[PDB]
Amino acid sequence: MEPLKMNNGRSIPVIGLGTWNSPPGEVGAAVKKALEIGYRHLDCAYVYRNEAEIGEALENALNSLRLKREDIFITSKLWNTFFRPEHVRKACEETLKNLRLNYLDLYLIHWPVPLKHGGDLFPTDSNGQLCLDNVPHEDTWKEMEKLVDEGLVKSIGLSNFNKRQIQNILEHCRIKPANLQIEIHANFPNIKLVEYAQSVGLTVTAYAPLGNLLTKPCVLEIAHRHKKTPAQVLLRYLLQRKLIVVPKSVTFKRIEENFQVFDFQLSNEEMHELNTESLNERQFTLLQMSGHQEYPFKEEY
């Protein structure tokens, strides 16, 4: 089905390959496999430290599959240690260098919690405490906006921001965020935040869309009824809530399975059942940032 239309007129494919700091050589092969299968959207991040492997696999795949750059949607994310305005540009340029691209389709602020610049990706005490930094969200955003002005990035957005924090960005911005990426799945539907974000015109991407979920009885019943797999039901559930999904995998069979979600429809009763059976508990809490003023998950949503 059809790419989601964003508030700036551009479109984003409703499924993309999620990447992560997987064992060496796995991501490169995953990128190629995904693109062969039909994926046209890759979700990346500086912090996984594998954008160079991705960039190479990507460049070789476009060539062997005879695909054009503009046929693919590429997302990357600005990491917490580069949120100070004077560092944003170089971090983006670095990511683009590694990905071997001239521009990104989408660039997200990875978290609302800045970390000290100039060392490791997770600057840490000898108490094991994270070295926090203080940088207003609107100041980082101003630099993100310049990336759009300059053509280095087509659309900008947010990751792991809460309602309050998004409100503030929208109140100050010249260029609105086009996308919000947050944890969403049947065991954590994140309904209030999703409804809020869509109400102000953002598109919303579910990360960790499979979240044990694959084992839940109602999930299995519904998969059986439709003659699809559990993962396929879990993704369709999110797709029917008008979400983009970026399921992470480096296993060929899973990459392929995740993509076969466009030839059936969950009924209203099935949708409702999944919602009422939800746990619902946040899986990705990053508690080591919980001491920061802008830690996103203490507010209701």
Residue numbers in the entry: 1 to 211, 221 to 310
Give the authors' words.
In this study, we firstly obtained the SjAR crystal structure through the X-ray diffraction method, on which a virtual screening and experimental validation strategy was applied to screen antischistosomal lead compounds. The rSjAR protein crystals diffracted to a resolution of 2.2 Å and belonged to the space group P21212 with the unit cell parameters a = 67.49, b = 91.00 and c = 54.67 Å. Residues 211–221 were disordered and were not built into the structure model. After structure solution and computational refinement, the final model of SjAR, validated using PROCHECK, had 92.5% of residues in the most favored regions of the Ramachandran plot and 7.5% of residues in the additionally allowed regions. By comparing the amino acid sequence with the homologous HsaAR protein, we found both the residues at the substrate-binding site (Asp43, Tyr48, Lys77 and His110) and at the predicted inhibitor-binding sites (Tyr48, His110 and Trp111) were conserved. These residues were located in the interior of the β-barrel, which provided a target area to begin docking. Compared with the known HsaAR-tolrestat complex structure, in the SjAR structure, Lys257 penetrated into the binding regions, while Gln297 and Trp20 were moved away. Additionally, Phe293 replaced Cys299 to participate in the formation of the hydrophobic pocket. Molecular docking analysis showed that AR9 located to the interior of the pocket composed of the residues Val47, Tyr48, Trp79, His110, Trp111, Phe122, Lys257 and Phe293. AR9 can bind with the residues Tyr48 and Lys257 through the established hydrogen bonds.
